[PDB]
From a paper:
Lactate dehydrogenase (LDH) is a tetrameric enzyme composed of four subunits. The 1,4-dihydronicotinamide adenine dinucleotide (NADH)-dependent enzyme LDHA mediates a redox reaction for the reduction of pyruvate to lactate at the end of glycolysis when the cytosolic NADH/nicotinamide adenine dinucleotide (NAD+) ratio is high, which is a crucial step for regenerating NAD+, and is needed to maintain glycolysis for the survival of cancer cells. Full-length LDHA is composed of 331 amino acids and includes a nucleotide binding region (residues 28–56). In our structural study, the X-ray crystal structure of purified human LDHA showed a tetrameric complex consisting of 4 LDHA subunits (LDH-5).
The LDHA structure with MA (bis(3,4-methylenedioxy)-8,8’-lignan) was solved at 2.6 Å resolution in the space group P21. The asymmetric unit comprised three LDHA tetramers containing one MA. In this study, one MA is located in an interfacial allosteric binding site between two monomers. MA binds to LDHA in an open active-site conformation. The oxygen of MA binds to S183 residue of LDHA through hydrogen bond. Compared with the LDHA structure with malonate or NADH, the LDHA structure with MA induced large conformational changes in the active-site loop region, which is often referred to as the substrate-specificity loop. The residues Q100–N107 in the loop region of the LDHA active-site with MA migrated to the open form over more than 12 Å from the closed form. The root mean square deviation (RMSD) of the main chain Cα atoms between LDHA-MA and LDHA-malonate was 1.29 Å. Binding of MA to LDHA can decrease LDHA activity in lactate production by suppressing the binding between LDHA and the cofactor NADH. Despite the inclusion of MA the LDHA complex maintained the original tetramer-like conformation.
Numbering used by the authors:
A (entry chain D), B (entry chain A), C (entry chain B), D (entry chain C): 1 to 331
Write the structure that this text describes.
């Protein structure tokens, strides 16, 4: 008899179906930063990685496995076949196309559509009850594409949206005020990028509205120039790409924060992109980031934030530009 | 409409089924210690508590709920009705009967058999697929009892066994050598109590056998009297009960550790009590403590420790004594 | 040639002094709840416990010690004698006298003063640079006493205040809303107890104020009853005491949350009692709960909440009550 | 008066010297893996990054700072100037020279001495009491270089050595036995690289020696060929480099596990590289991996493993080769 059998007596062997599996699609810097964050928060009893480049996929999987002694996620698997993703609670997408020189906004989205047209049906094939977390940019439009292709209900298709932008907001706010970002509250909503909206009314510390104590806040007369905080938020990623070539660590922690709320059914309020037909005068099928309650079933509730008219108009305007592209795609 | 409806648009309605639910039965000091450690290790999306004294149970649940801001377990429930325990992956049994002056050990067990005849079927009714972790004393016999009455397979009924005794042993080993318990290694096996067996052959640091270095180890010729380390293990709860009147914190911590291995499917080895007919000449249906691989199916494998003649004899003697009593029970 | 020395080669022997030491004064249910919560959050490399009953004290230290294997705090000590508290970064005081029948508020406070004339000087003797977290009740008066007897600067003397009161408020707020407490924001300030102040202006989810959305909120015209959420907060401990005899877990969790901000220099904002002479017209040396910024030097900063004139009145009445009793205390 | 002063009243302004600071030198993949794991395990209240490429340096620090909201390390600083390093408890060196096509061993080491002639004296300038953890390869020689240049006592210069080799060994062991690596015990010792020594005699589960059960274990007669497990350990990095370009995640988790033992003073045992002249019959100033007790003083103690005559001779010959390189280095 073999050493294993001499040492161990087996009671029963037939086993499986992981109870808390997460898949990351795409193992670029963003995907791997999500992977390492998820692993170190103990969110999953199985992590699956899939990407098109087979060697790097196997490489990144082997590197993670070599660190199992220091982890509590007993099964890490990889492959380009999406069969490795079967029975995932959460599937995080982070894959797609980078912008070519002088390319239209449209048609870039379309190349990305053509990618999701392979990724998304394979995901649904193997985890039909999963929740989908779209991180690939342009995240608002691509979350729509994944919803259209998957046929999932609107609550189980989530985009990372302004979740990291709001994190950055609060970091920069805490730097001005000398307070930890956990105690600086403030929301960046809407379309992810140049045209996000900073909701100055809700910017507080300990419930003290900063707009009340400083009514010029977020305007032009603002001698303290508080609108620069929101400018710094939308320039953040480019500032970091300029310096290290790409962002990864911050997006990876906010995705894990979002994974936490989903996998542990916390019902925490996050600014993520969800379908907001029926709200703020939006009548098209578009996703924008509003504060959502995330949990075991994705987005089960929305917070109806009171916007000004200038805020309300800026949202309807991004809604229109997104549908303008989205109506011009084809699937 | 309400303030809720005004602030919150709702997408879904409350289909749930918890996916990582734990129940502790018995809210004495042991149970509450298990509860608070499970809560602080983030092992469950729902904790249910059950006992017969309604007052204490509602207050303990309310006390925990007031801490929810600092926890990652968003639903804590309690009730004397076991319907609150529906859909538990793990049920931890701490309730029982305390031995009276001059009550024989048989009859003590039988009072517990009569209590378990109420708890175990109610647990099975609402969680037919759970793992059962029996913490109530005398643990080896009461694990037999919860097995018998539930009709679960052997892999899904576990007793605390010598888990905490082994932890205690490594603590004492650590203090003697000036190393942390995590890097001190030794196993206490068999019947939990005065007759447990210390496997002197397994005691080591960094794979350096202490018995080989110091052959006298564990005998009476031992100048360093290492046999009193096992004397301390089996007298610890007694000395701690002299001082504060009960033990709680170290049993809670050791139980939470087993729960982590089960809930996360780690396949770590722990000395817990499992039915060991077939090993070491034992031919009756007796539970003793032996190193068991723990995962999402409970005990999937066990380690066949090489024991000396003397060591094997004490296991045979405990199995006889245990069957001696189990033979006279009445289900 | 012992076993240890045959096994282990020593490089140097001297050179300890704990780097992140915490003391808990008092080992009643509250203090032990703090101890286990602090131990499970890994905030300390040394934990010291002191009380007058040597029995329970030694037995609580031994119970915590037995679980070392499951912990990351390598030294746990205890003693009647304060020299075991030497070199604490943080000393948490839970000890006190409890009101007997017939006894008046003053006299009970005087008894507490007399106990603090032994405890406080002995903390200072051995950890002169520590921060003092004062949990004993009435917490506002006794934070003053600790401040007066120690001569510590006011940043280094802190009362747990309405920390757990705000945490309760957010639990109940989250129940009414279907949202996790981490996402329901709201502050209870002032005197800890019946006279506490629920600052309705700051109540919000995602920065949407509930008062602005539903202006009857808090007042008596309020159809939805929100004023009762606060008096539920005020009767919480009473409802739990009536049921289980005392409260332990929730206060232990909130105190550990304060410790984490202090030990880790987070500069998170907490509603704790500090000396507020010079704000809101309060002119006497009196401690009430405001949002304080908390870190390695204690209360470094303090938020100035905008209060309505009735709210201002309440803090004035409370501060007047408190000086009424403190000017009668005998140090 | 600013918004900040309207919102916050300052009590105390000068505040500093950090109390749990860790520096990582080098912000390539290894160093950044260490940084994210350290941040992810709440080991430091300040983290400093140092490297010579200022752009990448600032970019990685900014990326991590943008996730502040998800972390518990309030201060992340960076600079090419080592003054940002001041008052570190622990300094992790990952920087070095990349090998060149057709460059000998003594040559590549010499260019690494040229680099350490700048790094080490600067570290020692600003943290003269720190612990030095060398991760740069060849780790055993470069740990010797760092010790010669620094003038530190041997307890405070630690090479990462075989720590990850043992972790990989225990993963491969667990993959064969169906047991988690935590419950699998191995020890790879000596010189990091092709010539390390797997101590077959220590390999066990639950104290059951594998070589005693299966005595051909590790040898050429082994019908199960367990020597192939060391072979996979020794060429695991070659395999990952060929697939993904470099190795990062697993070395980051293993360096963090070393950091947790030093910063929390655990006195866990780790196979790290230490100065061994005087032991295993070695006569020269060379560093070899050996099991060391790690705590706040660095290596306070080390374990004397009993080694066969073959194993001792493999260490002596590794030691002869290392001294042969080292005795020709130019400082
Ligand atoms: C006998 C143990 C056996 C054991 C089996 C199973 C277990 C267990 C311990 O703990 C948890 O599950 C020894 C040989 C080896 C060892 C290993 C790892 C170490 C160490 C020393 O120092 C620090 O990290």
């Amino acid at each position: 008899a073999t050493l294993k059998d001499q040492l161990i007596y087996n009671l029963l062997k037939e086993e499986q179906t992981p109870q808390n599996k997460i898949t990351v699609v795409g193992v670029g810097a963003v995907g791997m930063a999500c992977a390492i964050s998820i692993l170190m928060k103990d969110l999953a009893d199985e992590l699956a990685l899939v990407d098109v480049i087979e060697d790097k996929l196997k490489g990144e999987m082997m590197d993670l496995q070599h660190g199992s002694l220091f982890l509590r996620t007993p099964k890490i698997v990889s492959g380009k076949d999406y069969n490795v993703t079967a029975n995932s609670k959460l599937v995080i997408i982070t894959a797609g196309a980078r912008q070519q020189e002088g390319e239209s906004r449209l048609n870039l989205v379309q190349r990305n559509v053509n990618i999701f047209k392979f990724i998304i049906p394979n995901v649904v094939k193997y985890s039909p009850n999963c929740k989908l977390l779209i991180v690939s940019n342009p995240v608002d439009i691509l979350t729509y594409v994944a919803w259209k292709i998957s046929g999932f209900p609107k609550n189980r298709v989530i985009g990372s949206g302004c979740n990291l932008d709001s994190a950055r907001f609060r970091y920069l706010m805490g730097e001005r005020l000398g307070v930890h970002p956990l105690s600086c509250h403030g929301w960046v909503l809407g379309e992810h990028g140049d045209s996000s909206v900073p909701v100055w009314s809700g910017m507080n510390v300990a419930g003290v509205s900063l707009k009340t104590l400083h009514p010029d806040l977020g305007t032009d007369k603002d001698k303290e120039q508080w609108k620069e905080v929101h400018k710094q938020v939308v320039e953040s990623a480019y500032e970091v790409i300029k310096l290290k070539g790409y962002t990864s660590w911050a997006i990876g922690l906010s995705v894990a924060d979002l994974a936490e709320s989903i996998m542990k059914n916390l019902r925490r309020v996050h600014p993520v992109s969800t379908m907001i037909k029926g709200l703020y005068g939006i009548k098209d099928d578009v996703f924008l980031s509003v504060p959502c309650i995330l949990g075991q079933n994705g987005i089960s509730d929305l917070v109806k934030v009171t916007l000004t008219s200038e805020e309300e108009a800026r949202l309807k305007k991004s809604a229109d530009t997104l549908w303008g592209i989205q109506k011009e795609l084809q699937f």
